[PDB]
Scaffold this active site. Sequence first.
Site, short mmCIF file in Angstrom:
data_model
loop_
_atom_site.label_atom_id
_atom_site.label_comp_id
_atom_site.label_asym_id
_atom_site.label_seq_id
_atom_site.Cartn_x
_atom_site.Cartn_y
_atom_site.Cartn_z
CB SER A 87 -9.30 0.42 0.60
OG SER A 87 -8.80 0.74 -0.68
CG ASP A 97 -2.25 0.67 0.98
OD1 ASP A 97 -2.25 1.92 0.91
OD2 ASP A 97 -3.30 0.00 0.90
CG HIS A 119 -5.45 3.80 1.30
ND1 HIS A 119 -4.85 2.64 0.86
CD2 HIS A 119 -6.75 3.71 0.94
CE1 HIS A 119 -5.76 1.86 0.29
NE2 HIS A 119 -6.92 2.49 0.33
CG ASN A 157 -13.67 1.35 -3.81
OD1 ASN A 157 -14.03 0.34 -3.22
ND2 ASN A 157 -12.59 2.04 -3.47
#
Length: 279
Positions: free
Chosen positions: A224, A39, A69, A161
């Site tokens: 996520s 990530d 994130h 998403n």
Amino acid sequence: AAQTNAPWGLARISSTSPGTSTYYYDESAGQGSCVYVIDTGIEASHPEFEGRAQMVKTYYYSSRDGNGHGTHCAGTVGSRTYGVAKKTQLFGVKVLDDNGSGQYSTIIAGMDFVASDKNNRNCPKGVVASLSLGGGYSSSVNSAAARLQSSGVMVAVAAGNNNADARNYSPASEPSVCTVGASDRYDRRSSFSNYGSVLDIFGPGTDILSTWIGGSTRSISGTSMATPHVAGLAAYLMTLGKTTAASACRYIADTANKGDLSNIPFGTVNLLAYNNYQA
């Protein structure tokens, strides 16, 4: 063990019903397992990680998470308050820059890095990788995820998403990894969650409280956020000896809460990740 006033998603994964707020789990808590968070990095100094997190690789000028994130996702895997597997070891691999973007070539290198790097780590109960990222279909991205899985790592990936069929995104569309859609606190498919036959499981993804950079916390939404619930659950179940890296996705599907989500399109699994912990 019982964690009172837990984030709804933790409570949900140990419950046969929505609408509760205590997370119940076996005290082994993923000890002896490892989870790689591939990530934007991890703020390992965050008190919530208790020294159990560290950065092992970056492709940029810093291994620090300048975004948040990756720290949020890592928190859902394994932080003391916000995490599923509260005693796992967390390893950060920064394939995404501080704006959250990364080239597919860097992401592929990061996956192959994990497949080898696990041989440099002590993970007697098993290894998991959490991939809260993706873009358009790429056979090379899917193949890299397939290699990582084949190497002995439970790979969990975000479905995406786009409120669309995940067949058109990678690594979500790779069949051999665990593709994770998102649900909300009322057991509804999250409004943004991708769907389709390639999904293996749903996890909590709407309004998920977790760690953030600057020693902080915040609530955000996405596939996520659902992915690290499943990655942490896998590490927890592997520490319990109930499953293995190669079989954990199927085991989670086998033991999931079934038929309880709304707005699941015909042809997508109606399965919600569940730890089946009897206190």
